[PDB]
């Protein structure tokens, strides 16, 4: 179960622009 960790590719992605 994840949410943020689902976000984990979302923003992670956006941390690494």
In eight-state DSSP terms, residue 14 is T
Cα–Cα distance measured from residue 7 to residue 5, given in angstroms and rounded to the nearest whole number: 5
Q: Which residues, 6+ apart, have CB-to-CB distance to 8 below 8 Å? A: 2
Measured CA distances, 16 to 9, 11, 12 (Å): 10, 8, 6
Cα–Cα distance measured from residue 12 to residue 5, given in angstroms and rounded to the nearest whole number: 9
Are residues 14 and 7 in contact, defined by beta-carbon separation less than 8 angstroms? no
For residue 9, give the 3-state DSSP assignment. helix
The most distant pair of C-alpha atoms in the chain lies apart, rounded to whole Å, by 26
The experimental method is NMR
Apex 13 CA angle, 8 and 7, nearest 5: 25
């Amino acid at each position: 179960e994840m949410r943020l960790s689902a976000f984990f590719r979302d923003f992670i992605l956006q941390r690494k622009k």
